[PDB]
């Protein structure tokens, strides 16, 4: 189902870090729909293998493995959108499985094919291109970018859509709404002022984002 | 490691059928590098789930359910192999091992896109037919037999999945020119269980009986 439980535990910790959220067992359980028992046993198996280690934090090995999974995921997402032509809202679900079966060998081919891509189709930067040995490393979080929930709470304003985090992409219906209204990387949006739904307004229309969703969407305020 | 054990056992039995090899637990143990105890326990569980049946010969037979599931995995495998060669440009001898993992995670949604992208492909890059394209909704002889029957000039048509597991061998075959669509000269051999001498365009090579068996050709 998860295809690789360890890699999905590694990448969910890395996802929470990109979302600026503290990695906690309770959140890993909520994200991967796992029981408290299952998480505690999986975390136990991973710290033994020297992947993770206050009160969760990745090791140098676990961080590299987490990044290599994310790299495969986002290279897979580009391949699926740009070449294969799978629907924008269905691509993440596919990449969630593909990320666990891709060699570094096929990645190097995909990097050349896609022309040294830096971001996923959802605007998220592709990490570990230095460890693959075909590009520069990236910061998990760009300090220039602001979160739609922060922009809203701070009084709103017009902003450029930059990143939609992996957590948002688990809902295809939501990804369909964002595509229609025009909340997509490179498009400008109007974030209305405001635990209360954030009103976002595109060129065509708008939609209401839950705090957790709004937090995951990162924008450049004009 | 195998990604999906059940799917690999189903496709390994389907492989042995395509290769004209009697499907025994010993064959699965060799192909999937499993221990005897592991293979026996897996086959037992798969029979309970109605995927295969064990004959009195001790030989394994896929149910209509098991075949249907085996066909879907193989379809994904060969659609992945075409994508990996024709589009992505992964090396000829490295693509099978890649497809061997991809085959377990590819949706039908993607398969339908790959069918359109690759222009309705009928065979893998290794010449093996792509099965279950209908279900998705969109005189060949073995080199070992041709050799034993006096050899001759033959068009290479298919290289079985068994041969593709050895990248070094696939490199030799690529060099000498034993590849789907290229003519070869199969030299006659007297003895059974003796290596088959094949002459390609760019030189000659020595195939073991099991390898020669796995390659299918159209005699000219
Ligand atoms: Co994604
Ligand atoms: Co995944
Ligand atoms: Co193959
Ligand atoms: Co496989």
Author numbering:
A (entry chain A): 3 to 55, 58 to 59, 62 to 200, 204 to 231
B (entry chain B): 3 to 140, 150 to 231
What are the paper's exact sentences on this?
IdeR is an OCS from the DtxR (Diphtheria toxin repressor) family of transcriptional regulators which typically consist of three domains: an N-terminal DNA-binding winged helix-turn-helix (wHTH) motif, followed by a dimerization interface that contains most of the metal-binding residues, and a C-terminal SH3-like domain (21–23). The main function of IdeR is to repress the expression of iron uptake genes when the intracellular iron levels are sufficient.
We determined the crystal structure of Co2+-activated IdeR at 2.0 Å resolution. Two metal-binding sites are formed by residues from all three domains, coordinating two Co2+ ions in octahedral geometry. The overall structure of SeIdeR is highly similar to the structures of IdeR from M. tuberculosis and DtxR from C. diphtheriae. The structures of these IdeR dimers are very similar to the DNA-free dimer structure. DNA binding primarily causes a slight shift of the recognition helices, which is necessary to allow these helices to insert into the major grooves of the DNA.
